[PDB]
Amino acid sequence: AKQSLDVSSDRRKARKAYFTAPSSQRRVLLSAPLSKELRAQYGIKALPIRRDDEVLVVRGSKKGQEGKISSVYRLKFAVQVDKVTKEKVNGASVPINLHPSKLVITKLHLDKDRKALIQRKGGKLE
Amino acid sequence: AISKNLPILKNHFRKHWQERVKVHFDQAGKKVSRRNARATRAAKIAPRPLDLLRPVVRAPTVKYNRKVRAGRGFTLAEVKAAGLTAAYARTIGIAVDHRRQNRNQEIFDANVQRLKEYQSKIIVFPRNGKAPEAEQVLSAAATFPI
Amino acid sequence: EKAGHQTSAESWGTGRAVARIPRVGGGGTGRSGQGAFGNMCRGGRMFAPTKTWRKWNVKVNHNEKRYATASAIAATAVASLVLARGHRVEKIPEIPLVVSTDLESIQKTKEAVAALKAVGAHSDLLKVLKSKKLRAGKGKYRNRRWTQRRGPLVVYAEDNGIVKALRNVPGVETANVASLNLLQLAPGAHLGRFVIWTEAAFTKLD
Amino acid sequence: AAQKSFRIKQKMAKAKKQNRPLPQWIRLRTNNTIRYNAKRRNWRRTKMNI
RNA sequence: UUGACCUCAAAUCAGGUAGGAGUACCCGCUGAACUUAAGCAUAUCAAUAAGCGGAGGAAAAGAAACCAACCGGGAUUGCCUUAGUAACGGCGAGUGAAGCGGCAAAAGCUCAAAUUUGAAAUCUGGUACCUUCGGUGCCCGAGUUGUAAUUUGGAGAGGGCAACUUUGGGGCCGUUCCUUGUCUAUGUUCCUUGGAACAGGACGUCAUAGAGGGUGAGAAUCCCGUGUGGCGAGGAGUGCGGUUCUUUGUAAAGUGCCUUCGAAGAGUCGAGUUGUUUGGGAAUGCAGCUCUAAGUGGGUGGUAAAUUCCAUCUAAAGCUAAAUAUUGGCGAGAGACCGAUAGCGAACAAGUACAGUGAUGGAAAGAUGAAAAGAACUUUGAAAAGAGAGUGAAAAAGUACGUGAAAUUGUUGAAAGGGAAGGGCAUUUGAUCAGACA
RNA sequence: UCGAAUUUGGGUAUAGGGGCGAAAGACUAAUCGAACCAUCUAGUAGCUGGUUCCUGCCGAAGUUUCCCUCAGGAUAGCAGA
RNA sequence: GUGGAGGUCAGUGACGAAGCCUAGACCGUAAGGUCGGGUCGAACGGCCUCUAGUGCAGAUCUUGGUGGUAGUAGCAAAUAUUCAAAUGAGAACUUUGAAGACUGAAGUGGGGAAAGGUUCCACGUCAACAGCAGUUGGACGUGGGUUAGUCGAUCCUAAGAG
RNA sequence: UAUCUAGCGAAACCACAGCCAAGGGAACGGGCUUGGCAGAAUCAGCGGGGAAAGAAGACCCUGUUGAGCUUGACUCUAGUU
RNA sequence: AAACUUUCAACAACGGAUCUCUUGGUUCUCGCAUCGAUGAAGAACGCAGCGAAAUGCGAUACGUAAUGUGAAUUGCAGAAUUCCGUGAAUCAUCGAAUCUUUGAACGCACAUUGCGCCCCUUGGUAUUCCAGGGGGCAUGCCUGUUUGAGCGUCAUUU
Ligand SMILES: [Mg+2]
Ligand SMILES: [Mg+2]
Ligand SMILES: [Mg+2]
Ligand SMILES: [Mg+2]
Ligand SMILES: [Mg+2]
Ligand SMILES: [Mg+2]
Ligand SMILES: [Mg+2]
Ligand SMILES: [Mg+2]
Ligand SMILES: [Mg+2]
Ligand SMILES: [Mg+2]
Ligand SMILES: [Mg+2]
Ligand SMILES: [Mg+2]
Ligand SMILES: [Mg+2]
Ligand SMILES: [Mg+2]
Ligand SMILES: [Mg+2]
Ligand SMILES: [Mg+2]
Ligand SMILES: [Mg+2]
Ligand SMILES: [Mg+2]
Ligand SMILES: [Mg+2]
Ligand SMILES: [Mg+2]
Ligand SMILES: [Mg+2]
Ligand SMILES: [Mg+2]
Ligand SMILES: [Mg+2]
Ligand SMILES: [Mg+2]
Ligand SMILES: [Mg+2]
Ligand SMILES: [Mg+2]
Ligand SMILES: [Mg+2]
Ligand SMILES: [Mg+2]
Ligand SMILES: [Mg+2]
Ligand SMILES: [Mg+2]
Ligand SMILES: [Mg+2]
Ligand SMILES: [Mg+2]
Ligand SMILES: [Mg+2]
Ligand SMILES: [Mg+2]
Ligand SMILES: [Mg+2]
Ligand SMILES: [Mg+2]
Ligand SMILES: [Mg+2]
Ligand SMILES: [Mg+2]
Ligand SMILES: [Mg+2]
Ligand SMILES: [Mg+2]
Ligand SMILES: [Mg+2]
Ligand SMILES: [Mg+2]
Ligand SMILES: [Mg+2]
Ligand SMILES: [Mg+2]
Ligand SMILES: [Mg+2]
Ligand SMILES: [Mg+2]
Ligand SMILES: [Mg+2]
Ligand SMILES: [Mg+2]
Ligand SMILES: [Mg+2]
Ligand SMILES: [Mg+2]
Ligand SMILES: [Mg+2]
Ligand SMILES: [Mg+2]
Ligand SMILES: [Mg+2]
Ligand SMILES: [Mg+2]
Ligand SMILES: [Mg+2]
Ligand SMILES: [Mg+2]
Ligand SMILES: [Mg+2]
Ligand SMILES: [Mg+2]
Ligand SMILES: [Mg+2]
Ligand SMILES: [Mg+2]
Ligand SMILES: [Mg+2]
Ligand SMILES: [Mg+2]
Ligand SMILES: [Mg+2]
Ligand SMILES: [Mg+2]
Ligand SMILES: [Mg+2]
Ligand SMILES: [Mg+2]
Ligand SMILES: [Mg+2]
Ligand SMILES: [Mg+2]
Ligand SMILES: [Mg+2]
Ligand SMILES: [Mg+2]
Ligand SMILES: [Mg+2]
Ligand SMILES: [Mg+2]
Ligand SMILES: [Mg+2]
Ligand SMILES: [Mg+2]
Ligand SMILES: [Mg+2]
Ligand SMILES: [Mg+2]
Ligand SMILES: [Mg+2]
Ligand SMILES: [Mg+2]
Ligand SMILES: [Mg+2]
Ligand SMILES: [Mg+2]
Ligand SMILES: [Mg+2]
Ligand SMILES: [Mg+2]
Ligand SMILES: [Mg+2]
Ligand SMILES: [Mg+2]
Ligand SMILES: [Mg+2]
Ligand SMILES: [Mg+2]
Ligand SMILES: [Mg+2]
Ligand SMILES: [Mg+2]
Ligand SMILES: [Mg+2]
Ligand SMILES: [Mg+2]
Ligand SMILES: [Mg+2]
Ligand SMILES: [Mg+2]
Ligand SMILES: [Mg+2]
Ligand SMILES: [Mg+2]
Ligand SMILES: [Mg+2]
Ligand SMILES: [Mg+2]
Ligand SMILES: [Mg+2]
Ligand SMILES: [Mg+2]
Ligand SMILES: [Mg+2]
Ligand SMILES: [Mg+2]
Ligand SMILES: [Mg+2]
Ligand SMILES: [Mg+2]
Ligand SMILES: [Mg+2]
Ligand SMILES: [Mg+2]
Ligand SMILES: [Mg+2]
Ligand SMILES: [Mg+2]
Ligand SMILES: [Mg+2]
Ligand SMILES: [Mg+2]
Ligand SMILES: [Mg+2]
Ligand SMILES: [Mg+2]
Ligand SMILES: [Mg+2]
Ligand SMILES: [Mg+2]
Ligand SMILES: [Mg+2]
Ligand SMILES: [Mg+2]
Ligand SMILES: [Mg+2]
Ligand SMILES: [Mg+2]
Ligand SMILES: [Mg+2]
Ligand SMILES: [Mg+2]
Ligand SMILES: [Mg+2]
Ligand SMILES: [Mg+2]
Ligand SMILES: [Mg+2]
Ligand SMILES: [Mg+2]
Ligand SMILES: [Mg+2]
Ligand SMILES: [Mg+2]
Ligand SMILES: [Mg+2]
Ligand SMILES: [Mg+2]
Ligand SMILES: [Mg+2]
Ligand SMILES: [Mg+2]
Ligand SMILES: [Mg+2]
Ligand SMILES: [Mg+2]
Ligand SMILES: [Mg+2]
Ligand SMILES: [Mg+2]
Ligand SMILES: [Mg+2]
Ligand SMILES: [Mg+2]
Ligand SMILES: [Mg+2]
Ligand SMILES: [Mg+2]
Ligand SMILES: [Mg+2]
Ligand SMILES: [Mg+2]
Ligand SMILES: [Mg+2]
Ligand SMILES: [Mg+2]
Ligand SMILES: [Mg+2]
Ligand SMILES: [Mg+2]
Ligand SMILES: [Mg+2]
Ligand SMILES: [Mg+2]
Ligand SMILES: [Mg+2]
Ligand SMILES: [Mg+2]
Ligand SMILES: [Mg+2]
Ligand SMILES: [Mg+2]
Ligand SMILES: [Mg+2]
Ligand SMILES: [Mg+2]
Ligand SMILES: [Mg+2]
Ligand SMILES: [Mg+2]
Ligand SMILES: [Mg+2]
Ligand SMILES: [Mg+2]
Ligand SMILES: [Mg+2]
Ligand SMILES: [Mg+2]
Ligand SMILES: [Mg+2]
Ligand SMILES: [Mg+2]
Ligand SMILES: [Mg+2]
Ligand SMILES: [Mg+2]
Ligand SMILES: [Mg+2]
Ligand SMILES: [Mg+2]
Ligand SMILES: [Mg+2]
Ligand SMILES: [Mg+2]
Ligand SMILES: [Mg+2]
Ligand SMILES: [Mg+2]
Ligand SMILES: [Mg+2]
Ligand SMILES: [Mg+2]
Ligand SMILES: [Mg+2]
Ligand SMILES: [Mg+2]
Ligand SMILES: [Mg+2]
Ligand SMILES: [Mg+2]
Ligand SMILES: [Mg+2]
Ligand SMILES: [Mg+2]
Ligand SMILES: [Mg+2]
Ligand SMILES: [Mg+2]
Ligand SMILES: [Mg+2]
Ligand SMILES: [Mg+2]
Ligand SMILES: [Mg+2]
Ligand SMILES: [Mg+2]
Ligand SMILES: [Mg+2]
Ligand SMILES: [Mg+2]
Ligand SMILES: [Mg+2]
Ligand SMILES: [Mg+2]
Ligand SMILES: [Mg+2]
Ligand SMILES: [Mg+2]
Ligand SMILES: [Mg+2]
Ligand SMILES: [Mg+2]
Ligand SMILES: [Mg+2]
Ligand SMILES: [Mg+2]
Ligand SMILES: [Mg+2]
Ligand SMILES: [Mg+2]
Ligand SMILES: [Mg+2]
Ligand SMILES: [Mg+2]
Ligand SMILES: [Mg+2]
Ligand SMILES: [Mg+2]
Ligand SMILES: [Mg+2]
Ligand SMILES: [Mg+2]
Ligand SMILES: [Mg+2]
Ligand SMILES: [Mg+2]
Ligand SMILES: [Mg+2]
Ligand SMILES: [Mg+2]
Ligand SMILES: [Mg+2]
Ligand SMILES: [Mg+2]
Ligand SMILES: [Mg+2]
Ligand SMILES: [Mg+2]
Ligand SMILES: [Mg+2]
Ligand SMILES: [Mg+2]
Ligand SMILES: [Mg+2]
Ligand SMILES: [Mg+2]
Ligand SMILES: [Mg+2]
Ligand SMILES: [Mg+2]
Ligand SMILES: [Mg+2]
Ligand SMILES: [Mg+2]
Ligand SMILES: [Mg+2]
Ligand SMILES: [Mg+2]
């Protein structure tokens, strides 16, 4: 139940905000949940995906697969795992587009900032 | 366009009236806005009480002189007789009317006693600093009904 | 109000083998020549276009109003009307359903639901939930997307956390005796809302 | 015409430069939506009116 | 001869201000006709549209030359009402206010006319320094053809007498207000259908969070958010809460009594006439021309005049918040609203493309799929393409792309037809089908 | 008709109750007994045309009177409820 | 019978909603209602109420789409064409050579003003266009190209503007 | 030219349509009634008919509809005296 | 009997109705007060490694400076030194700048990339001519500064 006078339940206002969201906003929209292990490891539930993270597809056809995020394709609202790809007729390979909400994070890529973030949310780390 | 046994009506709609229709859609709006406006004035105004002291007054004409009714301000005579000056009575939340004249003793004693009871039932904080928080009674009209 | 009328379109008069609506003037665009203004023309003004000074609200006599809500309260007893209204109430102690005043002071949702269940509301809370449907109409994309049933009405005397504990459970509505609203006492003008009266509230009724 | 002002020769220059087909690479962009050049002009079909 | 004064000039003189835009709402000017009157000229539309000048966040109005006639009221604005009334009106058609009462908001004042005359006490500019929205010193200049203090009708001023009572200007930190940043619950466990589970079943958890959107199909618990709170950042500012430094002062103000006074706006008020306007009627406002006052005067008192009274304000100079307005602008929350021939003309490279000498006119046009996975390769072909293949859940989705009606068309099948066709009741024949037996 | 009251380019002036007219109401951008553009404007229309589902019950008038009335109104009458 | 709104049936649905098709079935006097099958792909209905931008054959109705007409009218002004080679998938129409003709310097020749604005030139090239065609083009694609003390403008004045 | 061919390919118009005689009928029917009759599918011509097509009759009347123009028609007006 | 015409159906055409969609429209309400000579609004021409347009910008040209984020951008190429970092980004924010030709539009004109004047400076043997660089010159009005005009007019000279 919305209660502030500055949230809008308007379904049109929302969809516009999502599709027209700027790159910086999509980073946080493209959040993946950490894996069971990593969650008790960091006291933290999920994190904005980033490139050299390690991930396991826990939904869809590529259920079970895993790999490193090759590129975050913020434009496409889609993340690409280099290891999860299509071959074509002409043999050629092509990335599949994956969504962070259907992935799980297994090994983080830690920055000075990536840590301070985990601590900003109230986590612990190794 | 005259027919049947109907009362002759006078519906003045021959100018471009549809141009000047005022629907008070903002009726609930402006009440919410008026309530908030007073809740801010209340808080700006320290423990002072939103309104000023109004006098008794006998309503004009042969139709309303039975009733008595809050007037504008207290006349220079009543203010003096009740023992204070015009200039100061204003800073004490008392409304003074330089225009009203006193011709009726009854009303006169009435308002001078109205000023006594007002003075006796307020407290005027010092100019210094202290500001001994004493919580606002909100009207004054309600406090000293007519 | 300016819709349909953003044209300087004239009739062509008769004598041109073509019907005599106003028509767009000029050339080079294929709008040029098309019927205009008319309520039967593509692009025209509509017939008797809607206006904001339509009567929206309605005056009901204050007293007729009370009679209505009084009556709506009266029938929150009468087991049959409540059943006939939806409202799975076969397994409740009695009607009216008066509950301990300790209900008004419950702060936490899970503890609230758990008592509602304890006193018999279980089946009705389940009617909602098992009933949420995608609204059939175009309303479904006009901020009226889902749909559901109406749960019990919990009437309190003093709000001490109860209104916040229940707010987020589907279908349950809370109300303060001194108020009381015909729209909840009789949703969609059917009588017999399942009401759980706190005891404090029950006595204040009188 | 055949001995013009710079203002006119300039307008024609900007004209020329708009008379080109679509740069085909655009057709490939994500969410691309432009199919052909819909403002293409031709000297013997639509005169530019100075 | 030299120095002023008055009035008038010039500078690429020192510093500034005006234009233009926009215009929803606001202050003015100007100003129709369609229309209504079943004709029409007065009237009406309308003191409206078009035209012109000027402002603001509001504008304007505003501290009574007011309303009244009462036991009187007491700036303005606005609502509810007064009232479709008083009144105006080829008294036709039509028109049409105000006082009182309730309410919203409230707030009050300052010039002119005075001898500072034992001291122009006042002020722009330059300049140096400073604690720079400003202060100080100094110097030009303004100003006596009057710049300050004092006073504003409610008063008030000069005398004389008698007593009390009261304060100014800074720092600095908060709060307040404005802009902002970040963080803050709970399943992705099993089974089934599926290309995809976000679907049904099973077992759970959170809930001051089951608003909403995203994600391969209806997702509280997958993601972002929501709820509740927490931690910050940058501003503004004298509202007020704290503090703290200067004492501004031989300063300024309030009140009682006695005495003398008591200045109060002119080509204006007013009057004639003309025109316009108004419900305003022997004339409601406004303007033009002519006439033009007074001081126990002047104005008003909704029927002209003469006389006598009475009531009531104080014009011809001025400022001022709120309640009020708002089809514009900036930012937000919404809807028993429209759903691509609808809704704004425009959901799209739409005020586009196109037309016109120009003023102007002004369209059409959304949807493959979860994903291009947008068809490798073979074969026939000059090519486009066809045929295989291949992708896909599906090509009964192939960038002619969701569904894909109708008119209309090709093919196939059946049937009828000697100047139309189609229809009614009825039955033969052919085709086709329900139900009921038990 | 064809050496001039000749033909013609460019520039320039005249603008809508106005222009220009060796005069035809001619010409004034395919527009002229009053140009084009927008707006007042959804101008008015006693006249013309159209006015969208089913069934059930009842069921007319073209006559009276007055009308600048005679292709229209009011009035009574007939009709339904 | 339709669009939307309150209530309810814990209604239907990706194991196929809505829609569309169907000289198949059934209910109603009728407006209509129900079902089967096929196509289809994400929503939708019954009942009590509420609500209106709520029902079409017509309006020389609005917008869009489509016929009969009909392979029809027609593609006849400007004297006119022909033989071969080359190219090309393809040649009445391109290119070359040969012939026959025309305009007949008051030009169908050689330049310019106004107007266009790249049509000029080259290379490539035929989906549309050039009312037969096309290998050609003023088409399409891709490039190149306009050199000034003396040629113009710029300066002057004209009617006139201001 | 038409006409036959190859390529290219419109428009008007269209309630449904297309054989007559008489009758009656809104007083000149393709349809209705009674007769005559009546056989696929077609090409070139043709101007009898389709009261053919082309424009909501310019004539004529009606409308309490206009407008250009005139005048001792009503009512005014710039100007002028 | 074909053909042809007609009717029904299946499959294929034509056409885009229907159903379901919706970053749009429409209406209501709340909050707020900010264009311009410090050159606005509007116009023109330009600007990317590969752009015609839309959007954005101005020869510093899909951007420069700053600040927050904390690793993209992505149609292709690309740089690679930018990933425990004064640091990715077609990011957000925006307080600093650049801001052609114009426009109230201001040296004059303007169907002209037309024609003057002044100052500083540089080169050409140059205060004077030519060329490059910089900075300037519209109108009305107010206050003041300076320089003036008039038997308008006061005094003061010998
Ligand atoms: Mg929050
Ligand atoms: Mg966030
Ligand atoms: Mg986070
Ligand atoms: Mg991206
Ligand atoms: Mg995705
Ligand atoms: Mg009657
Ligand atoms: Mg009215
Ligand atoms: Mg009218
Ligand atoms: Mg409003
Ligand atoms: Mg309000
Ligand atoms: Mg108040
Ligand atoms: Mg009294
Ligand atoms: Mg009274
Ligand atoms: Mg204090
Ligand atoms: Mg309108
Ligand atoms: Mg119009
Ligand atoms: Mg026609
Ligand atoms: Mg139309
Ligand atoms: Mg419309
Ligand atoms: Mg209408
Ligand atoms: Mg009632
Ligand atoms: Mg709980
Ligand atoms: Mg659930
Ligand atoms: Mg439902
Ligand atoms: Mg709906
Ligand atoms: Mg729907
Ligand atoms: Mg529907
Ligand atoms: Mg030339
Ligand atoms: Mg043009
Ligand atoms: Mg031109
Ligand atoms: Mg100067
Ligand atoms: Mg202006
Ligand atoms: Mg104006
Ligand atoms: Mg007028
Ligand atoms: Mg009108
Ligand atoms: Mg009338
Ligand atoms: Mg009339
Ligand atoms: Mg009439
Ligand atoms: Mg008339
Ligand atoms: Mg009227
Ligand atoms: Mg008038
Ligand atoms: Mg009006
Ligand atoms: Mg106007
Ligand atoms: Mg203001
Ligand atoms: Mg402003
Ligand atoms: Mg205000
Ligand atoms: Mg006064
Ligand atoms: Mg008053
Ligand atoms: Mg009356
Ligand atoms: Mg009347
Ligand atoms: Mg009036
Ligand atoms: Mg009125
Ligand atoms: Mg009152
Ligand atoms: Mg004040
Ligand atoms: Mg004093
Ligand atoms: Mg003074
Ligand atoms: Mg599964
Ligand atoms: Mg979904
Ligand atoms: Mg979805
Ligand atoms: Mg659903
Ligand atoms: Mg969701
Ligand atoms: Mg949900
Ligand atoms: Mg939840
Ligand atoms: Mg949630
Ligand atoms: Mg969550
Ligand atoms: Mg800031
Ligand atoms: Mg006065
Ligand atoms: Mg006179
Ligand atoms: Mg006037
Ligand atoms: Mg009178
Ligand atoms: Mg008058
Ligand atoms: Mg008097
Ligand atoms: Mg008198
Ligand atoms: Mg009085
Ligand atoms: Mg003043
Ligand atoms: Mg004022
Ligand atoms: Mg608005
Ligand atoms: Mg709201
Ligand atoms: Mg909104
Ligand atoms: Mg549209
Ligand atoms: Mg349509
Ligand atoms: Mg509609
Ligand atoms: Mg349109
Ligand atoms: Mg869209
Ligand atoms: Mg568009
Ligand atoms: Mg335009
Ligand atoms: Mg355009
Ligand atoms: Mg187009
Ligand atoms: Mg689709
Ligand atoms: Mg489509
Ligand atoms: Mg898709
Ligand atoms: Mg798609
Ligand atoms: Mg193969
Ligand atoms: Mg094969
Ligand atoms: Mg194939
Ligand atoms: Mg499937
Ligand atoms: Mg399918
Ligand atoms: Mg296929
Ligand atoms: Mg499909
Ligand atoms: Mg394809
Ligand atoms: Mg399709
Ligand atoms: Mg025959
Ligand atoms: Mg039969
Ligand atoms: Mg049996
Ligand atoms: Mg005239
Ligand atoms: Mg005229
Ligand atoms: Mg004139
Ligand atoms: Mg024309
Ligand atoms: Mg005229
Ligand atoms: Mg023209
Ligand atoms: Mg109409
Ligand atoms: Mg008539
Ligand atoms: Mg008529
Ligand atoms: Mg009936
Ligand atoms: Mg009968
Ligand atoms: Mg008469
Ligand atoms: Mg008559
Ligand atoms: Mg008739
Ligand atoms: Mg009668
Ligand atoms: Mg009867
Ligand atoms: Mg419905
Ligand atoms: Mg469908
Ligand atoms: Mg079928
Ligand atoms: Mg069938
Ligand atoms: Mg059946
Ligand atoms: Mg049937
Ligand atoms: Mg049945
Ligand atoms: Mg079926
Ligand atoms: Mg089926
Ligand atoms: Mg289906
Ligand atoms: Mg779908
Ligand atoms: Mg339902
Ligand atoms: Mg109903
Ligand atoms: Mg309708
Ligand atoms: Mg019909
Ligand atoms: Mg029908
Ligand atoms: Mg329809
Ligand atoms: Mg139809
Ligand atoms: Mg029809
Ligand atoms: Mg009909
Ligand atoms: Mg039709
Ligand atoms: Mg046809
Ligand atoms: Mg052919
Ligand atoms: Mg032929
Ligand atoms: Mg011919
Ligand atoms: Mg020939
Ligand atoms: Mg010859
Ligand atoms: Mg050969
Ligand atoms: Mg030939
Ligand atoms: Mg030969
Ligand atoms: Mg030869
Ligand atoms: Mg010859
Ligand atoms: Mg010659
Ligand atoms: Mg010759
Ligand atoms: Mg020649
Ligand atoms: Mg040449
Ligand atoms: Mg050209
Ligand atoms: Mg050349
Ligand atoms: Mg060539
Ligand atoms: Mg071809
Ligand atoms: Mg061509
Ligand atoms: Mg051709
Ligand atoms: Mg061809
Ligand atoms: Mg080319
Ligand atoms: Mg080129
Ligand atoms: Mg020369
Ligand atoms: Mg020159
Ligand atoms: Mg002049
Ligand atoms: Mg022939
Ligand atoms: Mg032959
Ligand atoms: Mg042929
Ligand atoms: Mg041929
Ligand atoms: Mg032709
Ligand atoms: Mg045709
Ligand atoms: Mg018919
Ligand atoms: Mg027929
Ligand atoms: Mg016959
Ligand atoms: Mg016979
Ligand atoms: Mg006969
Ligand atoms: Mg006939
Ligand atoms: Mg016979
Ligand atoms: Mg034959
Ligand atoms: Mg024949
Ligand atoms: Mg004939
Ligand atoms: Mg014919
Ligand atoms: Mg005619
Ligand atoms: Mg007509
Ligand atoms: Mg006339
Ligand atoms: Mg005429
Ligand atoms: Mg006469
Ligand atoms: Mg005469
Ligand atoms: Mg045989
Ligand atoms: Mg059928
Ligand atoms: Mg379509
Ligand atoms: Mg639709
Ligand atoms: Mg969708
Ligand atoms: Mg909306
Ligand atoms: Mg709101
Ligand atoms: Mg570009
Ligand atoms: Mg871009
Ligand atoms: Mg920028
Ligand atoms: Mg780039
Ligand atoms: Mg690096
Ligand atoms: Mg940094
Ligand atoms: Mg940065
Ligand atoms: Mg950015
Ligand atoms: Mg620069
Ligand atoms: Mg800029
Ligand atoms: Mg100039
Ligand atoms: Mg220049
Ligand atoms: Mg010049
Ligand atoms: Mg030098
Ligand atoms: Mg030298
Ligand atoms: Mg320069
Ligand atoms: Mg001066
Ligand atoms: Mg001087």
Side-chain angles (χ1 to χ4, degrees), chain C residues 43-109:
Chain C
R45 178 225 335 111
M46 55 144 112
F47 158 74
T50 40
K51 304 267 186 160
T52 48
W53 45 86
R54 177 195 309 265
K55 243 196 54 198
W56 300 104
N57 293 35
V58 185
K59 247 206 189 66
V60 180
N61 309 307
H62 200 151
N63 187 73
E64 214 167 310
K65 213 152 172 193
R66 286 149 171 186
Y67 199 135
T69 76
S71 270
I73 286 160
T76 63
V78 200
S80 19
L81 316 202
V82 195
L83 275 155
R85 221 219 123 256
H87 287 330
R88 322 275 187 277
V89 290
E90 294 171 331
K91 177 65 177 62
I92 80 166
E94 70 198 14
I95 262 195
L97 219 243
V98 193
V99 114
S100 146
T101 316
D102 291 329
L103 203 235
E104 286 154 25
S105 306
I106 304 191
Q107 312 291 322
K108 222 49 156 34
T109 277

Side-chain angles (χ1 to χ4, degrees), chain C:
Chain C
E1 67 75 55
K2 71 154 177 275
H5 277 245
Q6 311 221 45
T7 310
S8 56
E10 241 165 68
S11 213
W12 290 5
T14 179
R16 278 234 237 160
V18 84
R20 34 179 152 100
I21 357 84
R23 310 180 109 97
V24 169
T29 193
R31 171 62 164 156
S32 40
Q34 302 214 310
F37 300 97
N39 85 287
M40 72 263 136
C41 312
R42 177 171 177 270
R45 178 225 335 111
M46 55 144 112
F47 158 74
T50 40
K51 304 267 186 160
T52 48
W53 45 86
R54 177 195 309 265
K55 243 196 54 198
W56 300 104
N57 293 35
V58 185
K59 247 206 189 66
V60 180
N61 309 307
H62 200 151
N63 187 73
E64 214 167 310
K65 213 152 172 193
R66 286 149 171 186
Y67 199 135
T69 76
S71 270
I73 286 160
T76 63
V78 200
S80 19
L81 316 202
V82 195
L83 275 155
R85 221 219 123 256
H87 287 330
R88 322 275 187 277
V89 290
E90 294 171 331
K91 177 65 177 62
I92 80 166
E94 70 198 14
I95 262 195
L97 219 243
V98 193
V99 114
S100 146
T101 316
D102 291 329
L103 203 235
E104 286 154 25
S105 306
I106 304 191
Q107 312 291 322
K108 222 49 156 34
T109 277
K110 189 194 167 153
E111 177 189 2
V113 189
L116 285 178
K117 275 149 144 180
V119 91
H122 180 68
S123 264
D124 238 35
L125 316 166
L126 216 240
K127 173 175 51 58
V128 201
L129 281 41
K130 304 272 266 161
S131 71
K132 171 149 305 294
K133 291 274 187 178
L134 230 224
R135 148 119 39 189
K138 281 177 279 208
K140 134 217 308 133
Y141 51 59
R142 291 183 178 185
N143 304 342
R144 278 170 264 132
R145 178 187 216 75
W146 299 90
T147 240
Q148 73 189 12
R149 293 301 80 76
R150 212 80 106 81
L153 194 215
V154 174
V155 175
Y156 64 90
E158 197 222 342
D159 174 23
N160 289 298
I162 190 46
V163 123
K164 263 184 195 158
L166 279 180
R167 105 158 78 121
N168 196 73
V169 5
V172 187
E173 278 175 64
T174 49
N176 165 336
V177 250
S179 163
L180 280 183
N181 176 341
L182 175 57
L183 298 176
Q184 297 164 319
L185 278 174
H190 308 144
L191 303 177
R193 244 263 228 203
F194 179 34
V195 181
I196 316 190
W197 305 96
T198 77
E199 163 189 6
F202 197 60
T203 36
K204 182 173 223 199
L205 233 32
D206 230 85

Side-chain angles (χ1 to χ4, degrees), chain B residues 10 12 15-16 38 58 61 64 69 97 99 130:
Chain B
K10 300 181 73 178
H12 296 49
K15 334 200 189 195
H16 285 354
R38 293 189 276 278
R58 201 129 274 248
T61 80
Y64 288 131
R69 173 260 287 184
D97 182 12
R99 312 183 204 96
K130 42 225 59 266

